[model samples]
Structures are given as structure tokens and as C-alpha cells.
Target: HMNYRELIERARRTTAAEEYDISGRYPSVIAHAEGAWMTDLSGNRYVDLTGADAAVILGYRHPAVNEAITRQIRDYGTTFASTLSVPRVELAERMCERYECAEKVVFHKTGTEGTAMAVRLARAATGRELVLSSGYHGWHEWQMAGEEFGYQQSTGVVGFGYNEKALAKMLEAFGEQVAGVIVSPEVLYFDLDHYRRMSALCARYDVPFMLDEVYTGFRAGPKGVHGLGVPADVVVLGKGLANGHSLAAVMGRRDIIDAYDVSGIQGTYTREVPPMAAALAVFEVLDTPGVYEHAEAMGRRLADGMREILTGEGIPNWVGGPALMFDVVLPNDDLGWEIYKTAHDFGVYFEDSGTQLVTAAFDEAAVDHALTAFRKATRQVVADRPDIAPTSGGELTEERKLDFAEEAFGGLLRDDERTNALIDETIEKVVNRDRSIKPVLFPAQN
Candidate 1:
């Protein structure tokens, strides 16, 4: 049987192994998952704090969603876009009915396509070339037009900070040429007045106000941004929409969405029925009373517990965002990554980006288990690497400090042959035997 090292080496040769953010952090390949826990190939269990990077908000293999997908598969096979599926039509109506700003909807297979389509619709309706954006959108050309790592040749996209003055300055300089302003509120603090001002600015300038609710949609509640009282011309929904299924939606005012009539947005698998069926089941689960309340409570418990442990350990930290979706920010990004690796060793998985999504399947027991693992991980890292600890009132700028950190510890794991050998030995010892675990729900077929 292949061990973790062999599996990783094979993937490195055949696939883009470095693309996954969890590449070096996790110890072994995941074997199976249920509810809020994941078991590695070695049979070690962990309370999954990453929540599939916020895509599996309801948990892995949720019974309701699984049954819905299974039933749909038995009733009607997957199809191309030539024929309309019942689940497709039902999902569109459900989404439009819940999202007040969305009178019409267009389906896609991924968040990248949804956001790209939103940009196309905005530009088509407004007949403009420029776009204003904030927060991470996706890798699509129009969204990544201004970034160095993106399609560097693409143009007419400008980024602004999350503040009223920044938005005002950008609008003053290029409002007339701007087609839309796309923003993601998941990472930012909740400020209703700020959203109102931004919406009013877009309206005054005749530009579309597109809300990228890809991470915040159903996870935030049924209405998503509706409860925030912010007016949006267009919205993108994905991630937790179908509880890990490949489904996304671009929806907005009928006038703007009508641009799709001539925009040429089409995909063969966009109308697939299984993800739509799962999405319908997800909506039903969301409607259950106390479902969101339980999630919010669990989220607060976990965040508060982590904050307490970090404070006791004298590790400078802050937790931000709403209860449903939040992040734990450390003194430095490099230290944050180290803590992530350390936590993984303790059988708790978290994203390197610091985002920890709280899913409905996480109960009090899961929260306690994760907290205990976190306490041990933080204490171990601080004891071994004192220099990486936080300093009081340092003179170095945040940027320079981050640079120093990168230079100091960024190559620790990747450059160490002994560490890699140790990891290989560890995996081989634990994963020598294999058992057939239950298959993952909705396994991708080729």
C-alpha cells in the first residue's frame, strides 16, 4: 500500500501539488469524513475546523443533502444543457424568492464562473470598461486583471481599500468608466452605513453594485445580504450553497441579468441536476428552527476559547468576523502558518489563511476537542521558538516585520531534509494497514 510520502511524491510528479494551500501542513491523505470530523488514511481523527475551506458549511456528507443527491441520481441521470432539469428550475426559483435583490438567476459550476458572469453582465449592461473591486474575487481574467499573479495583460480593473474615503477617491477619478463595484463582506467588519454609502455611490454613478456573497450566502442565513439592508444590483452565491457540491449562481435585478440574453454565457455542466437537488435539501435544512442559532453559538464558543488560550500563552492574537465565518489573526503571517502546521500535528486542521468556518455539525464536543489541541500547539511553538513570539511596541513597520519573518522561518519546513524524512517515517508507521472506509458522498467520476 502507498504511504503518505509516496502518495505526495506521485502527486508532485503528475499534478500541481504545490497549488493546494494545505500541501505541507497536513500529515496524510484524508481517507473519509462524516459530520464535523475527518479521518486520515492512517485512521487518526480530527475535528475539522477548516470546513473544506468554507465550502462544507453543513458538514461532510450531510444526510439530507446526500439523500437528495442519491434520489435525484436514481430518478434522472445527469445531463447536458440541452434539457431543462426540475431541480434546476426549483433551485432558481428558491434562490430568487429568498434574495430580494435577485429577480433572475443564472447557474454555473463554480464560483469563478459566477463572478466572471456577473462582471460580464455588468459590463454588458453599462457599456463600460473599468471595474472597482475589493477583497479576493477569483482567478478569472476580469477579476484578476490588476494583480501581478493574475492575467497581467488584462486591464481596466482597480482595487480599493475597505473604507469610504478610498471608494470616494476611486469613484471621483474613474466613476464614469467603471462598469461595477464588486465587494466581499465576509472578510470585513459589519458596517451597515458603509455598505449604504457604497451602494449610494454606485447608484449615483450608474454603476452596478455587485455583492460577491460566494462565501457569505446561505451560510449567513436565508436572505444573505438582505438582513444587512444594503441594496445590491447583482450578487454571486456559491461555496456552502449546496454543502460541498459544485454549484454556484449569479443573480440580480432583471434588467441587468437580461444582458445574458446576448452575453454568451454557457456551459455544458451548468445545468446538472445532482448539485441542484442537494442545494434544495440544503435550503430545507437551513429553514429548520434554531439551526443557525446553534451554529452561531458553537462558533462563538470556539473563537472565544481560542482567544482565551492565546491570551494566556502571551501570544498576541485577535479573532474577527461574524460568528458564522471568522478568522484568528496572529502577530505575523509566518507565525500563523507555523501554528497551522503545529495544530495539524495535534490532529486539528485549520486553513493557512486563518479562516475557520463553523458548520452546523460542530457540536460542543468538537469545539472542546479543537480547543485542547490548539492549547497544546500554541504552547509547544512558543516554547521552542521564543524569537517568533510577539514583542511589545516594536519600531518596525508591519510590512518590514512580515518580511523579516518570511526571511527567518519561511523555509523552515520546505528546506529541511530531516523533517521530511521524519514525516515520511511517521506516515509509513501509522498507515501500514488499510480498511475500506465508507465512500465519500458525491465522489467525482471520470
Candidate 2:
């Protein structure tokens, strides 16, 4: 049954001719997808648990969404230079209505542009140049310019760690000079209290608080983070906003949004009808009585199933939360990669390594299929390497051991219960065996 390796190799041979760097070729390439399943050119079917970087929140090429695009195409494919499309204005108005603070909405070609524009509005409103941000602020140079060493190669934009302590330090250091604070509301690694405290600080300081919900926005919930009652000066939306369309939006407070007046946030071909129509269709689907709820339910099931697989197999990993989002981590990237490959071999393509994020579009059945494949792979791979399975290195070198422990610990609490348990078990084994894995700071009862 698992003899499809030859077919995958053949597909890789073909795909390598037109390779792209986003994700290297492997069990990654797929020829088609429907709902929650993807079929590679080799005809291997995967559960598609990764959900195309969470952009397929509603599932791959949802019929209604695809139909909307098709219908729009019949009218016209695209437009440029001096035109305001109907779908553009309609989607904007509906988008603004989703959030209480969004008095106005502006669309852009990408979430990066939306974020950049939002930062501009904040600067225009506060009349300051400095901006504070937590997490990745997209590909824009301004955001990168403030990052560590980013000034040299990326934006040196001051990227603050998410928490009250980091926020306090940034505010104290650049309070007077800071114009705005942009952040992701999903507190996976950071403490929620600290994020809330940081948000409060931004409000108290009169600094524009921009929420970069480009990935989480509509996916987090209908109203996104702002709907969660967090005060936001500006919220950027994209990716899942148009249900994988090329359009993005910046929405928030009236005066701050108006700051775009003097600031030029214009793009001639950005608000094209196709993406706008798709976005409007997305809005319509989101407005459906139980769509988000259904997604949340599905997301929870997938996460739970993954947890079950990791726990049952006794693999060292971490699983995470949010019905619309989750992730997993192994003892190290090597083991992680091994797990990824094994899963792919089992017909579940989790291609992204940098961010192991998942979405609700991956329903229970799909996750179950993935779990079954993963379990077999884990048994075959992990069970065969018990000595290195726990430590991620067979030789017990200090650096390799430390690196493995770091990845294990960092990812453990990120959300996978089974992985968390496995780490504890591994640590216990190490301590019992008189190995040197004790230096790793995991929350063990002393």
C-alpha cells in the first residue's frame, strides 16, 4: 500500500524543472485538492492538514467561492487605471461593518501592503515616525528596518517580544517617539495577560494600536481580534479575507483611517473585481449562520486528533490552540523533518517548517486519515530509534542535545498534549539513565 514512493520520486523529478523556493519539492507537491483532501501528481492523496498556510480557511476551492469567481469572470477578468469596481466598495462596506471600530475600510493588493498602509495612517495620525510591533510585520522594509540586524539586511523596525515586560521596555525606551504599536493578537507563546497589558499601554499612551490580523483576522472569528473586545486603532486583513484572493484591507478608527487622506495609499490595479468579488463572497460565507462555528468545530477536532496521535505514539511534540489555528513541534528540526516526511509518506502533507500552523478547513475525517498515516510512520520510524527518539541525537553531543531539547521544550507547550507528555517521559528516562539532558529547563516537579 505504501509503495507510492516511486511515484512521488517521479513527480518530484517533474516538479524540479519549475521549482520554487517557498517549499522544496518532496511529499509537498499536489496536483489537485477538494474540500480537505489534496492529490499529488503521483495520485497520492493527503488530508491537507496545513490548509495552504491557513488561507484555505473555508476549504480548498469551495464551490460557492469558486462559482463567485467564475461568475465575476464572465463579466470581466480584470481592470486597471481609473475605475472603482462595485464589488470593491461593497466588500469594503461589509468589512467595516464586521468590526465596531472600523468606520472606514481601504483595500490593498496584499496583507503586507495593508499593514504598511495601516502603519502609515498611524504615523500620519500621531505625526510620528517610530512604530512598535510584535511578531512578524510582513515583508515591508519599514517593519524589517526596525528588526534586529534587520536594519542591515531587513527592517530595523523594533520588533518587540509579545508581553507586558517587552511592551513596557519599548514604551519606556521609545514612548515619546513611538507613533503606533502593531501586533498579532493570537498569544501562543506569549502570556495573554501580558498581551492585554501591552494593548492597554498602547491605548493609555495614545499610540495607535494596529492589530495585524492578516493571517488570523476573519479566521479567528467573524469580527477577528477586535471583536474579542481588544481595543484596536487599526486592523489589517488579508489572505483568508478574500478566501485566498489577492486583496487585503486596513480597517479601524475613523480619524486614523482618514489619515490616509494626505498619505497616498493608492494602487491603480489593486481593487480589481475578481479578488473583490471573491472577498465579498467570503464575507457572505462568513455571514452564514454557522460557518465560523463549523470551522471552529472542525479545527478543534483536527487538533485533538493530532494530540491523540502524538500521545498514542509517544512522540515528543507540542500541539497548539484556537479552533482556527494550531501547530506542532518535534524534538528538533531533523526529527520534525523526519516526522514531516513520514507523515507525507503516510499521505499527509505538512510542508511548512518555519510556521507549523493549521486551520479549520482541515476537518475531522481528514485529520483522522492524517493521524492514521502518522501513527504508522511514527511506529515505523520513531520506534526503531528509541535511543535517539527521546533526545533527537544518537551521539549525545552537547550542542545537538541542547538543540533538540530546545526545540522540544519550545514546541511542547505550544499546544500538543501528547508531545508535552513525551518530553516529560524523555526527561525522566534521561535522568534515570544518568544522561546529561537535565540542563534543559522544562517544568518538572523537583
Candidate 3:
């Protein structure tokens, strides 16, 4: 029978296994999934607390979304290149009506595409080169311009920390040349005053303020800026737009969106209809009363439970961010990974970064189960790795930071090597089995 081990070997051979392996600590191959849970090929079930890395916002195989996709498939083919589809137009209308800043919309296949397009539009509209960014954007060339593995050698893109002093210094030096300032408000816990000041700065310099809402789009609320009561010139939406489907949108004022017509940004799969149908279905669900509140309530329960468990176990931890999307920050990275792996072994899956994304499907029972797993995982980590456990008077020094980085990098490499070794072993075993179990040659010859 096909098992997780064999499936993993296949994935290794055919895909970029490292990207999805979770540092080789949690590598189970999923057979199927439903609301808040996934079952691996080995029949092991897991409560997916991370929401498939925060993409499956509503749930796995949400009935409404599934039905919409099915109906679209039956009514129309997948692609409608250069042709307007009903669902596409309807979704665009719905989004524009909801997002006050978005007067026009352009669809794309991924969050990266939407972000890249937003930047291009900003540059086109403002006739400037510099882009000041905060928090993670995406893997687009413009977004990753200064980092390793980036396409550009060096670019006008620069990063700023999450403080007024840093923002003031950077903007003072680069504001004249800055086309836009891209940020995710909730990622760094920006307060209302901070947002107001940032917006004022952007306005003062005539720089477009772009909000990357790829993670918090539908999860935060129907308005999708966490209802923070701030305005942005450009907004990028994805991740939760179509539940688990590949869909994204770059939307903003009419003049800024008109840049697409002047300087074309195109993709063939951008015109796919099924994802549009799914997005429409998602919007329908979001429009329902108390959906966002339900997600918030469930998320609060999970976060509170985690805090209680960690504090009770004497593990220094803090939960930060909004109720729908938050993180459990441990004292150090090593201890964090240990707790994550332990939780995975206990049939609860969280992200490597310890971020928890609560969806509408997560109820009280799911939260309770996840809390139990979290408690057990923390207890086990404390018992086994006492050295890494947090003390009441722990200090974060520069030397300790360097050590943590080196150790984390080493661990990552080791996990990569282990995955490669398993793939090689599986290949060898298959080759030997094929050779030893050769078809009945003698009988065939006779």
C-alpha cells in the first residue's frame, strides 16, 4: 500500500521538497482534508492549526466554495483569456464596493504577482524609483531586490524597521525619490497613531501608501484592512481571497489602476474562472453576519490557552498580533522549533514560525484539542531540553544572537541533508525491488 514514506519520496523526486518539508521535522503526505483537519496517507489525522499556511481561511473543502467551483466547471471552461467572466466581474464589483480605496481592480494568480503589480503602478503613477517596505511582501523580483537570490543586483528598494525614528530617518533621506511605502499594519503591530503618522508622511511627500493584505485580507474582516480606520492608495489581496485557490488582486484608485493600461502587466492564468468563482463564494461567506467575530473568538481562545500553557510551564512566551492572525513568540528559535515538532508529533500542525491563523471552521472543540496538544508539547520540551528552557532573567545579547543564527542555519542544513538521504534510499530500494522482481522471464520465453 502507498504510504507517507513512498509519497514523500515521490514528492522529493518531482517537486522542491525543501520548500514544503517543514525543516524535515513534519513531512507527512496528506491523503485528504476536511474542515480543520487533514489525514495523511498513513491514516494519521492532524488538526491543521496553521490553516494550510494561512491559505485555507474558511476550511478545507468548504461546501459553498466547493459548490461554486463545481458549478463554474460545469458552466464554463477554466480559462477565459481576454474575455470577461461573470464571476470575475461580480467578485471585482464586490471587492471594490467593500474596499473604500479600491475604485478599480486587476486580477492575478498569486500574491507575488499582485504585489509586483502594485509597486509598478505606484512607480508609474508617481514617476519615482525608491520603495520603502516593512514586513514580508513576497518573492517578486522588486520585493526581493536587495536580498540574496534576488533578481536585481541592487535597487531603489529599502527596508525600514517598525518605529517612528527609523521611519523618519529613512523618509527624510529618501522621501523625494520614494514612489511608495508598502507595509502590513498588523504584522508589526502598528498602532492607529503610527498609521496616521505614516499616512501623513506619505501624503506630505506625494508617495503612494500600498497595503499588502495578502495574509489578513478576508480573515481580518470584510473591509480587509483589519478595519483599522486608515486609508491606503493601493491594496493587494490574496491568500484568503479564494480560500485555497490561486487568486490575487491589485486594487486602488482609478488613476493608479489606469497605469495597467498604459504599461501592461499580463499573465495567461490570470484569467482563470474557477478561482474567480471561489472568490465570489468566499465573499458571500464573509458578508454573513458574525463570521469574522466567530474567527476572532476562536483565535482568542487558542492564543489565551497557549499563553496559559507556556506561562504555567515556565517557558517565556508572548502572543502578539490580531485575534485572527497571531504568533507565539518563544524565548529562542530552538525552543520554538522543539515545541512545534512536539506538537506535530501530537497531531497538531503549526507553522515553523509559531504563527497561528484561526479560520471560521475552528470551533471551541478544535481550540480545546489544540490547547491540549500545546500543553503536552511544552511539557515534553521542558523535560527533554532543559538547557534551552527560558529562565526568569534571560538576557538577549549580541553574542547569543549570533550563536542562535549559526545554530539555526546548521539545523536547517542538517534537515535538508536528511531529506535528500531519504530520497536517495527510496530510489535505491525501488531500483533493487524492480531488478529482483523481474517478470517471469523463463515462463514468458517458454
Candidate 4:
């Protein structure tokens, strides 16, 4: 028998981590998960909106994937130990056949390692030093850029703006010296032409253009941007591919892949059989009719339903993204946190991080139930904290923004840097309604 409080207290005493923090660590505690539902120790079930950080696309304990994993463990040995595997070869072959540019493939346990290997390959192929890129690749020194958190510093890996002007300018100035240009589908600020323009620029400069599809890949679609005809040179696939297993693969042209010999990077455990078997089974599930369509429809419904419910409640919120994955943004981080806590109580689990993903396992019932829970959460938050609640059925105005800042900050909000920063963060959430993954807030005043 598990007690959430007692177990959490015990964990806090032993573990040197944020694993117990409800707000910081998603999935702090859960007894079991099946399909789109997760059950806590108290037997409270929640429609899982986070989907284990959008990795469990087929839902928990998918029969095919589970069978594949257990079968591999029993038959194939848990470790590769520098040996090849049938599942690995088959997965790579299938990927090469399916994706446009994948002439070869290599495996890694996570997206971070996959992206790192791709960068290594790019640099080796191009004989260049700097990498021009954007999006979260990993927590490596190159990506982290600074020794301390909450600070900005420089690294060989330079980040650029999410616009054509900034991209073109960076290429114009440093394209020749750049080893690679890689980007994840961070905000879907891309189209056919966006990729085409990037492809053309990389072609002109002979820079390797990589798609870090770790977050998108199978979650976005079976072949993802490749199915949509993206002209990328290299792609790193992760997250939803193995359904619930930790696996990633870097797929690309033979030449760049062969650059591995010239570059020389190696790691053990990249050739394990369990994740490969699970990945193959996941593909099998994808091949069945209407997998992507069901996920797409469910995602659209959830997004639309949430937006309508939150808006009708006069909550300051913004929700946007494709049917597959969307962000439910409550600019006020405090309110967002409250929704996370309250939603869980009402039988739905939302990621405090704002991004909610839909899996093929989701259906009408799950989506509708989540929306109903959200409606209750909204009303409850309104009932408890009406001071922060926006006026129902009216536009979010400048006066309202100021009013929210004043209410949230009260007397301590003064003409000072720290409080002003707090004010800026609070108010900006209600003003012109700016959307940024790295956010803003008093209700946002200058």
C-alpha cells in the first residue's frame, strides 16, 4: 500500500532530486496507467493529457508494444553487448524505405544523444565549427551555454530567431563557417516553403540541415514532416516512435552517416533490442487503418473544447497548436499552476508545463471528459480567486490588464527592478496577448 504523502516524505528524505515536486516534476506519483487513463494510489483515475511527456502515443501498456518488449527481453537478452538485432535492422530498413532522405540510420537511447550524434556527423562532414540552430536539443554543454541556470552565455552552438529575416541574415553572415543548421518543430512556425527556404540555404552553403523530430516524429505523423515532403538532409526521430520506450534514431543520407568513421563517436547501449522491438510494434500499430486521423480528430476536439470552456468562464487563457499537440497557455503562471492542481482533482491530468498532447488512444469520451473537468476547474478557480479571473464574455482590455496587475501585486508592486519584473510578468499576460514559450506578466505594463 502506498500513501502519497508518506511516500513523498520518504522520497524527500532519500532522493536528491525534484521527483517529488508536483509542479516541477510531472507524474510525481502514479500507481498504474492503462490506455489514456492513469490511476493514483488512492485509486483516483485521471484522463492523462500529458501522455508521459507526449511519448506514450499509443497509450500505456499497448498490447503489441508490451508483447514485443517482453518477448525481446526473454528471447534476445536485455543488452546488445556489441551485437546486432533483428528488430533494429528491420526498424532501420523500414525507416530508410519510408523517409525521403534516410539512406542509413543509427540508434541512440534518447533524443539528446541522437541530436548530438547528428551534430557530430554534420561537423565532421563540413569541417566547420559553429552550429546555427534553435529549439531544445538537449542539456549538453553546447546547448546549455552557461555554467549556471537562469543565466545566458555563449557557446559554439548559436541560436537564431524564428523568422525568415533572422535566418537569412545569419546564413548570409556566417553560413560558410556554420557546420549545420538544425531546428525542432518548436512552435510549428514552419511550412513547405519554410523548409524549402532552409533546404535551399543549407544547399547553397553546403551545411547539413537537420530536423530534430524528437518531439514531433511519430506524434506529428507516421513519417512526420517527411510525409509532408520536407526537404531536410538529416532527421533525428524520438519520443513517440517506441510508444513508451526510450529510443531515438538519426536517419540521413549515406554520405553524412559515413562521416561517422571520419568523426569517431561511440557509446554503448545504443543497440539494445527491447526498444527496437517495441518500435517495430509501434509501427505495426501505425500501419493499421486510421491511426493518425483518430489522433488528429481527438486533438482538435480537445483543443477547441478547452478554448471554449476556458473562454466562457472568462479565464485569461490562450490555447493554440495543431490537433496532434497544442499549448493551453494561461499567461498567469499562478493560474496555470492552479489549473494543473485543480484539474487533477477533477479527474484529468494536465501538464503544468502548458503543452498537452493527444494520442491515437484518445476518443470522444476521453476528450469530452477532459473538457468537462476543465470547465469545473475553471469555475472552481473563479469561485475561489475571482480577483485573478478575467471578466466573462468581454475582451481582455488594457484597463483590465492594469487592474489585474494591481490586484495580483497589491501594495508591494513599486517602482523597483524586482517588483517591476514581477509586475511586467503579471500584466503582460493580459495585454496584447503575446505568446512565447519563454514567457511574460503585471498584467504587462511598461
Quote the RMSD, in angstroms, for model 2. 11.8
lDDT of 1 by residue, 131-201 (tens): 67765578765565432211111344655534455456556655776779887664334456777788998
Clashes of 4: 14
Winner on lDDT (2 vs 3): 3
- List, residue by residue over 102-121, the lDDT tens digit for candidate 2: 88988888877888888777
Off by over 4 Å in 1: 19-22, 80-83, 145-153, 186-190, 220-222, 391-446
Instruction: Report the lDDT tens digits of candidate 4 across residue range 1-446.
Output: 86787777777778736543643654447899988888888888889988788778899998999999999898758885665777888999988888898999999998989998998888777776657666667778766441111112234455542334545655665567677887775433345666677778778877888888888787556777656777788999989889979999999988888887766667778878899989988888888899778888998899899888878876666677566777776545577767677887788888777778877788899999998988888788878886666645554455444444333222121345754454344233322232232112111211
**What TM-score, computed on C-alpha atoms, does each candidate reach?**
0.84, 0.78, 0.84, 0.83
Query: How many steric clashes does model 3 contain?
Result: 0
Q: Which ten residues in a row are the worst by lDDT in model 3? A: 437-446
* Model 1: colliding residue pairs: none
Error of 3 at 98 (Å): 0.3
Candidate 2 lands at a TM-score of 0.78
Tell how far residue 239 is off in model 3, in angstroms.
0.9
Q: Each candidate's lDDT (Cα)?
A: 0.72, 0.64, 0.72, 0.72
Candidate 3 — which residues are off by over 4 angstroms? 19-25, 145-153, 391-446
Count the clashes in each prediction: 0, 17, 0, 14
Q: What stretches of model 4 exceed 4 Å from their correct place?
A: 19-28, 146-154, 188-192, 392-446
